[PDB]
Amino acid sequence: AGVKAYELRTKSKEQLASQLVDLKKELAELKVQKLSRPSLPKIKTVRKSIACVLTVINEQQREAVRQLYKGKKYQPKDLRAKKTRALRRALTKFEASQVTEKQRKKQIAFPQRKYAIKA
Amino acid sequence: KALKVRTSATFRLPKTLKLARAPKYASKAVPHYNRLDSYKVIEQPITSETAMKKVEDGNILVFQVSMKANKYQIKKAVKELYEVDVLKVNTLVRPNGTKKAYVRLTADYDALDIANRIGYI
Amino acid sequence: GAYKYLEELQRKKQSDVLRFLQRVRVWEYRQKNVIHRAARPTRPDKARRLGYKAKQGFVIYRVRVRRGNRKRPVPKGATYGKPTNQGVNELKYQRSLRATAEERVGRRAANLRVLNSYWVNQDSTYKYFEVILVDPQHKAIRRDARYNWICDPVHKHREARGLTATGKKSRGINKGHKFNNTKAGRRKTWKRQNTLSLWRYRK
Amino acid sequence: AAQKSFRIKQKMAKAKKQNRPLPQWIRLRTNNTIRYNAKRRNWRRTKMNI
Amino acid sequence: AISKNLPILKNHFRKHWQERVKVHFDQAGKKVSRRNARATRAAKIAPRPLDLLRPVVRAPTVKYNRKVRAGRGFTLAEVKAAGLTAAYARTIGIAVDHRRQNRNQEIFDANVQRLKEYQSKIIVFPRNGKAPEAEQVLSAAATFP
Amino acid sequence: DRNTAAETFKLFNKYRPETAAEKKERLTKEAAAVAEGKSKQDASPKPYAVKYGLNHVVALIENKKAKLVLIANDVDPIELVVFLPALCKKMGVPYAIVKGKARLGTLVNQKTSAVA
RNA sequence: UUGACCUCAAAUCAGGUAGGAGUACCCGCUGAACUUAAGCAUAUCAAUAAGCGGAGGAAAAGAAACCAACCGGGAUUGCCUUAGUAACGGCGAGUGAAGCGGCAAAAGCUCAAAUUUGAAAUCUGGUACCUUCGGUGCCCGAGUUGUAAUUUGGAGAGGG
RNA sequence: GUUCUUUGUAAAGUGCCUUCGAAGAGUCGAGUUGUUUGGGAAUGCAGCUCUAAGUGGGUGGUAAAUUCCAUCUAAAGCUAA
RNA sequence: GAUGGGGAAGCUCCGUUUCAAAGGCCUGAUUUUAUGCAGGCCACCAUCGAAAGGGAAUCCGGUUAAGAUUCCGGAACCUGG
Ligand SMILES: [Mg+2]
Ligand SMILES: [Mg+2]
Ligand SMILES: [Mg+2]
Ligand SMILES: [Mg+2]
Ligand SMILES: [Mg+2]
Ligand SMILES: [Mg+2]
Ligand SMILES: [Mg+2]
Ligand SMILES: [Mg+2]
Ligand SMILES: [Mg+2]
Ligand SMILES: [Mg+2]
Ligand SMILES: [Mg+2]
Ligand SMILES: [Mg+2]
Ligand SMILES: [Mg+2]
Ligand SMILES: [Mg+2]
Ligand SMILES: [Mg+2]
Ligand SMILES: [Mg+2]
Ligand SMILES: [Mg+2]
Ligand SMILES: [Mg+2]
Ligand SMILES: [Mg+2]
């Protein structure tokens, strides 16, 4: 059982918030009934449903922030790339490709020609 | 021309204007949801026969509470979830590592009536 | 320009004008901290010859280091060995003072890369150097392919490994017969010359 | 030490939970090689040294 | 120590030599990798012969001067005599050395005439157009022994 | 002398290099002239301005082109300009020691110029 | 009085950046002793072990202030060889490279030191826009105590 | 291979004649001390003292003077296999 | 035992007010308004270090299988606002 992720994504934040506070309610009363019956595996689906809603709530919030910071430098660090420490510090392909005027003229004038040795 | 009059042979660092932080971007840009919710500070009552004695006799409720919660939160949460005023709160750390809360309700309310309303008696 | 004049004039260290400047300047550097930021190079020609340029990301630090030998850090001079190794007072510290000045500056400002250093003044107890430091994170240095080579992580702490002008001199790496022991690395060659190579078919 | 620090009392709780025999249903799993709780401790023979 | 009528031996095995022992178990494996490297290198430069034309030149060291040996580069004075610039030649496949000079004519013209066959024996593809198929050979040295 | 210094600054102020703004409009006029007059960038008259720049001026005296030069007395490596008065004396170029590199800097729309 | 410059500070000032781990290999510093010499101090073990500082997938070295003495070769690196040789050594024990030759792979180069002076032509940053590993406009700033273009010795520059 | 931009009155290369041709300093080098090397009147490195020149400087494995010759061009820097 | 500093190649060492430009304290103004200007004031200048040293304030009766100067009943006190 439990709530599925895809149909939650069609909701809004207030509906999700109402869903969450409702979800936390039964987990309370399932927990008090857990000590009554010898076993109750139904609580597992309840807790997972809370996680699914919480992920959905977070997912919507970040995307709206991403749209807010779209198209301008200095985005929040957690929304940046998490490749490595080294790669983030590495030279970008633009700056690595930069070359002085003296060398650019030599490359354009004298590139490595394609030659064949048969005759 | 003239010099500033100094009436103290000790020189101290001048007071300069201090700016206020105006970050170009937010730190995390998504504020964390409330870490310690009323549903998280209290999770389940304690149904030991000794605990049941306090409920029926002393008008005292018993709960297991998160170790991060203090008496202010416990009193705040109980009157929230159960809409019942709290006289005083006693807390202790059980030998198994969990926190046990002794909540005493005002005489205007009955602990036994609240207990079975929760679903245990 | 006037760089030729300033370079030629500097070679006359015993002239009246230079020694007067040397006398005045050496007093000033003692007054300030052991390591302190220098607004502009003392010898603009000498710095730019070593690689300095007048733009953002180029930093000059002034450092003074104590002259003399290296006393053996041993309690009361008792070495506990054969008489060959009992020497304490006349030890020499194979690395140059110019090198150890670069290392201390590099530690102070780890966000910059050490390039070169040069002598500016000296006295009985201290020797004074100015070090050329380059900021790799500055955009004006990330661009300008003439200098973006320093941004590559392989050149972290050149002075610590001895990749500066002084380090290679101290490491003794040069072409020639006089540098047989240290031509491709003192320890590298030693491992080569002390490695027994065996093939599948013994020769 | 009746008057003890919370850190010691936190190590207290885990030791209480550790001291418990093997659950019986562990016996019945397929390819079960665990015979008993080998890491059992008792206050008379072994001290925690915490 | 000294026992019989045996010759004196000099066995330098007093250091911790066991820690530095290289046995070339990977001889066969390394050889295959080299051949694989050559094939892959050939593929990326398909029309090119994988090596540059080296000059013919006389050996030093009167023990060896009777023999002739391949050189490194083509002595800028030589390539000028061949009628092309050093910049162009190195873009074509002629190695150029700027620190060896000409002191024997018999070497000089042989290297000069060596270039003139190579200029005749190669097809330089236009930088823009059709680039005819090559049917590459893998070594210019074998072309011009 | 400050009376002499005041007079020469009055002279030099009339010969000041073009600012960033007026340079921008200047080249646009030449661009306009190129478009229609096709003049080889010589529609503008010959410019008259004070020559500044330490390396720039030093080469000028060596070619005996500088009519008059000025020296800042407060250059924080003094060795940058110690030789220069002798150099002008050898070349016969008149020179003047003047107070204030900042005063020169204002003369050339900069902070410090140390020579004019 | 007002406004600059130079030097030096303060900001939870706008952006960044360094620290620790691993360490087989790599770049340096520091640095023994057991042992051998049938004793033992120089020596040897050893420019090693331990300790300390610093990177990358390789590092380091690298395009001669070279090797050579020949009809000269020609960056660096590695193998076979040179060679247990020249040499060092209570010339005792012991230690001990380099040139040439064959082969593997091969790749070259750039700054300062020149006045553009008929135009600091240069660059970081902020803002706005855009097709965003960045681009354009505009605005401050850096910089003449020198950022752009050309030149790097194999040359090369100014002139006709 | 297919396509859109034409970079660009831009840039580079090549001959002849003439004038030039800037090139690294508390560095090289020398003495002493210590260490190290196979380097031996001293291979390298380091400390102290002295300390330059420009047809100059370094090397040519025996120190020194005199006279030549050869060979490179430091005390600044990047670079795969 | 940090910091300012000074040593040490370095792990780290010395030093705790020392060759430091080492700060908050309160009152009032402003009621576009939040707090900068109005002032004035002061000179130690981190921190850690005691369940027996110093230290604000609680007692009695009753209750549990096992808790109590902590729970219940009654009666007090201190600190802050
Ligand atoms: Mg308590
Ligand atoms: Mg010392
Ligand atoms: Mg010892
Ligand atoms: Mg013995
Ligand atoms: Mg024995
Ligand atoms: Mg013995
Ligand atoms: Mg070790
Ligand atoms: Mg490398
Ligand atoms: Mg390198
Ligand atoms: Mg040895
Ligand atoms: Mg040593
Ligand atoms: Mg020696
Ligand atoms: Mg301390
Ligand atoms: Mg305390
Ligand atoms: Mg106490
Ligand atoms: Mg007392
Ligand atoms: Mg009392
Ligand atoms: Mg008891
Ligand atoms: Mg009470």
PDB file of N, CA and C (backbone and C1' of nucleotides) and ligand atoms in Angstrom, chain C residues 94, chain G residues 30-31 47, chain H residues 35, ligand 11:
ATOM      1  N   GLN C  94      72.156  21.372   3.772  1.00  0.00           N
ATOM      2  CA  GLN C  94      72.312  21.346   2.318  1.00  0.00           C
ATOM      3  C   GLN C  94      71.402  22.295   1.541  1.00  0.00           C
TER       4      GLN C  94
ATOM      5  P     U G  30      69.887  18.230   5.129  1.00  0.00           P
ATOM      6  O5'   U G  30      69.338  17.458   6.406  1.00  0.00           O
ATOM      7  C5'   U G  30      68.857  18.165   7.539  1.00  0.00           C
ATOM      8  C4'   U G  30      68.213  17.225   8.521  1.00  0.00           C
ATOM      9  C3'   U G  30      69.078  16.055   8.956  1.00  0.00           C
ATOM     10  O3'   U G  30      69.949  16.391  10.018  1.00  0.00           O
ATOM     11  C1'   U G  30      66.943  15.268   8.327  1.00  0.00           C
ATOM     12  P     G G  31      71.409  15.736  10.100  1.00  0.00           P
ATOM     13  O5'   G G  31      71.125  14.184  10.296  1.00  0.00           O
ATOM     14  C5'   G G  31      70.510  13.701  11.479  1.00  0.00           C
ATOM     15  C4'   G G  31      70.067  12.271  11.316  1.00  0.00           C
ATOM     16  C3'   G G  31      71.134  11.299  10.852  1.00  0.00           C
ATOM     17  O3'   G G  31      71.996  10.878  11.890  1.00  0.00           O
ATOM     18  C1'   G G  31      69.190  10.974   9.573  1.00  0.00           C
ATOM     19  P     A G  47      75.352   4.134  -0.503  1.00  0.00           P
ATOM     20  O5'   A G  47      74.905   5.588  -0.961  1.00  0.00           O
ATOM     21  C5'   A G  47      73.579   6.039  -0.740  1.00  0.00           C
ATOM     22  C4'   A G  47      73.488   6.899   0.494  1.00  0.00           C
ATOM     23  C3'   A G  47      72.204   7.691   0.662  1.00  0.00           C
ATOM     24  O3'   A G  47      71.163   6.912   1.228  1.00  0.00           O
ATOM     25  C1'   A G  47      74.067   9.094   1.059  1.00  0.00           C
TER      26        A G  47
ATOM     27  P     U H  35      82.710  16.195   7.850  1.00  0.00           P
ATOM     28  O5'   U H  35      81.507  15.870   6.859  1.00  0.00           O
ATOM     29  C5'   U H  35      80.190  15.682   7.348  1.00  0.00           C
ATOM     30  C4'   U H  35      79.186  15.739   6.227  1.00  0.00           C
ATOM     31  C3'   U H  35      79.389  14.731   5.109  1.00  0.00           C
ATOM     32  O3'   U H  35      78.836  13.464   5.414  1.00  0.00           O
ATOM     33  C1'   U H  35      79.045  16.876   4.185  1.00  0.00           C
TER      34        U H  35
HETATM   35 MG    MG J  11      73.247  15.301   5.718  1.00  0.00          MG
END
